[PDB]
Paper text:
Hemoglobin is a heterotetrameric protein consisting of two α subunits and two β subunits, and each subunit has an iron-centered heme that reversibly binds oxygen. Hemoglobin transports heme-bound oxygen from the lungs to all of the tissues in the body via oxygenation-linked shifts in the conformational equilibrium between the tense state (T state; deoxygenated) and the relaxed state (R state; oxygenated). Populations of deer mice that are native to high-altitudes in the Rocky Mountains have evolved a genetically based increase in hemoglobin-oxygen affinity relative to lowland conspecifics in the prairie grassland.
The type S highland hemoglobin crystal contained 2 tetramers in the asymmetric unit that were connected by intersubunit hydrogen bonds between subunits C, D, E and F. Although the UV-visible spectrum of the dissolved crystal solution indicated the presence of carboxyhemoglobin, we were only able to assign a water molecule at each heme based on the obtained electron density map. A comparative analysis of the highland and lowland deer mouse hemoglobin variants revealed that main chain displacements were present between α41 and α54, the loop region near heme, which resulted from a α50His→Pro mutation in the highland variant. In addition, the highland hemoglobin variant had a reduced intersubunit contact surface, particularly at the α1β2/α2β1 switch region. In addition, highland hemoglobin has a reduced subunit contact surface at the α1β2/α2β1 interface, and this difference in interface area between the lowland and highland hemoglobin variants is similar in magnitude to the difference between oxygenated and deoxygenated states of human hemoglobin. Our structural analysis revealed that the highland hemoglobin variant lacked this interaction, and also showed that the α1Cys34 side chain was pointed toward the subunit interface, allowing the interaction with the β1Pro124 main chain oxygen atom.
Residue numbers in the entry:
A (entry chain D), B (entry chain B): 1 to 146
C (entry chain A), D (entry chain C): 1 to 140
Write the structure that this text describes.
Amino acid sequence: VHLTDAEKALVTGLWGKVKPEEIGGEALGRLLAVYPWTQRFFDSFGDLSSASAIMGNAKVKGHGKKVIDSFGEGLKHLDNLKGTFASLSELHCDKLHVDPENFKLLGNMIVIVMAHHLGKDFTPAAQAAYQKVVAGVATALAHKYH
Amino acid sequence: VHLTDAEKALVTGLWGKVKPEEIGGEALGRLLAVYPWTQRFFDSFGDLSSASAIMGNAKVKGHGKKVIDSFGEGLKHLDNLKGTFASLSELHCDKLHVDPENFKLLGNMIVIVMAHHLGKDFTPAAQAAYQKVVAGVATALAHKYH
Amino acid sequence: VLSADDKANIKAAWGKIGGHGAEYGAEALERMFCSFPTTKTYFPHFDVSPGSAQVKGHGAKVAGALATAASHLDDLPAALSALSDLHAHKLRVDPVNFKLLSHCLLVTLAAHHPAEFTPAVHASLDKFLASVSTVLTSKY
Amino acid sequence: VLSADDKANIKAAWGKIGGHGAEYGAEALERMFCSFPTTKTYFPHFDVSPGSAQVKGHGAKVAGALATAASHLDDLPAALSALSDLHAHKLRVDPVNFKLLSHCLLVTLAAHHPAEFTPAVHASLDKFLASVSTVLTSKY
Ligand code: HEM
Ligand code: HEM
Ligand code: HEM
Ligand code: HEM
């Protein structure tokens, strides 16, 4: 919930070195291929039958920008990480019925994709910080599961 | 979670027809039996080599008794699970290093032990009432998990 | 995976169920909907009210699949392949709800056979339900 | 379990690893200890400070077993039963930690092999490490 400003500077300084739109597209696409039951929530999105189809699915990329942009906002208020996502936890819990364990899985994809794009510069310290960000975002998207 | 009075009356009503030391002793024992890696947290307890040894362990009986006392203390403060489980949450977090996922395993063992003792009186409605309680206990045990 | 005593316990435990499995499945589903009502969303076409004829006849189905699994413990992937197509490929059930139904099924078993639901049998059946769950939520 | 596609991607992916394994296995451990510091309580006797002789030599052992698992996919319970005893019977590692370590391994392969770490390969490897986890965490 609270990073050291060393960790905080690590996340914002490496976020500036990636293009958030393809971070979201790849992460959401990698969730769908690695944890394919997640596709059940995406039937209006068209073809999700294979890895290449998910990666070539135009609405999956479009939805990754929505996901990643709201994630970007989370990176601007790491201290009130709960309030920015309260509309989203509202929406995933009560209208879509996404099990809260799956929020961790998408955050793991964001971490794996950051490593993919950044190579050596995604050090264990870089991951340690970003793990804290996705852990807190995931718990935030779960605050309304009763 | 918040419970309707019909659910509070159901939970407190059925609680007064079991003896908690049996529930606690049986729930902790079944946890260690069903989920063997939880034994790792109980090396000063001695023999946990078999289901036979576990359910015969006198320290297990003793600890299940104290666990059920705290659970029972939660049953009287359902609308205050945070504050009532603050002391035990930080102990499990910072000292014991107990992964928070395991809180729900022990909670589930409490449900199953109630069904064992109560038979058909543990109605599906009775289960849903108790399921809400153990999920609250499990949540409260794990938000001061920094 | 399972041990010899798991296999022995699962098979021993499954024998004591007998013709009650059809009802134990129906009760397990009803307990799953009553406690975890978001699992109703997997059965929109069902009358899921308690005592519904559809949940009754479906508990008999789930039962028959579990007894089949209990007698083919070495190779679950083979004997449940057709059922893995259903729950994974087309239905795409979140693995979490198998844990839910597994728990409700063990609640049912604890609620009906107290002298037989020993801690050892319980541990083996939990692993049994974990193995069938892994088979059915696999291969999308 | 895995599919023929998953088995094909595992051998192929591990094949493209080569002599880098021992290095990846150490970096993975280093990522786990740094991201998930409670995992360090499983190695109370190790150095576990960044750069270490023991952690590096231990990463090789982790990398060696995975190579064995990668070529014995149809019989992991057999070729990993010695490792199951250590982690499940002896150490009693909490399953949650095998997911943390699995995750850091995939970060390592993503960080080192961009072009080869395709979404399909990623998917097959997550089932690979998850199958290995199940064996290593199971009693049997
Ligand atoms: C960190 C994790 C996540 C974030 C930040 C996030 C964010 C968002 C956002 C911003 C929307 C916009 C709503 C819209 O305009 O339609 C959305 C919708 C949605 N999300 Fe996520 N989400 C996350 C996790 C998940 C997971 C794990 C699932 C399912 C496995 C999921 C499934 C959906 C679905 C089905 C929609 C509606 C899509 C549509 O109807 O257009 N989300 N999410
Ligand atoms: C419903 C969930 C739980 C409740 C209500 C609970 C409650 C308690 C209580 C009352 C104590 C005694 C503290 C004292 O007397 O000072 C305790 C200590 C302890 N708990 Fe739990 N606990 C729960 C879950 C767990 C789990 C899941 C684990 C491990 C898997 C665990 C491991 C321990 C250990 C090792 C101790 C200390 C015993 C010793 O050091 O000998 N607890 N807890
Ligand atoms: C031990 C675990 C399970 C077993 C053995 C099992 C078994 C079965 C069987 C035998 C059928 C009927 C196949 C046929 O004859 O056509 C079926 C269908 C179905 N199952 Fe399950 N199942 C399990 C878990 C679950 C869970 C956890 C869910 C959802 C939460 C689920 C949802 C469904 C649905 C929606 C159908 C379709 C029924 C229909 O369309 O009428 N299953 N399953
Ligand atoms: C798929 C994942 C893993 C694999 C393949 C693996 C493999 C191994 C191997 C090959 C050894 C050496 C055995 C020997 O000396 O004969 C070992 C030892 C050990 N492992 Fe793992 N392991 C895994 C996950 C974990 C995790 C998650 C933990 C704890 C968080 C862990 C903790 C240990 C410990 C404490 C030792 C003893 C080290 C020593 O005494 O030298 N392992 N493991």
